[PDB]
Amino acid sequence: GLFGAIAGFIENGAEGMIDG
């Protein structure tokens, strides 16, 4: 479901995508 395309992008900002 579409949540899986966002959630972390709002709930932090896609942590791990920065940090990786």
Distance (Å, rounded) from C-alpha 2 to C-alpha 17?
19
Which residues lie below 8 Å from residue 9, measured CB to CB, with a gap of 6+?
none
CB 14 within 8 A of CB 8: yes
User: Obtained via which technique?
Assistant: NMR
Question: What six digits make up the tokens of 9?
Answer: 């992008």
DSSP result, 1-20: -GGGGSTHHHHTS-TTTTT-
- Cα–Cα distance measured from residue 6 to residue 12, given in angstroms and rounded to the nearest whole number: 10
Asked if residue 18 lies in contact with residue 11, where contact means CB atoms within 8 angstroms, the answer is no
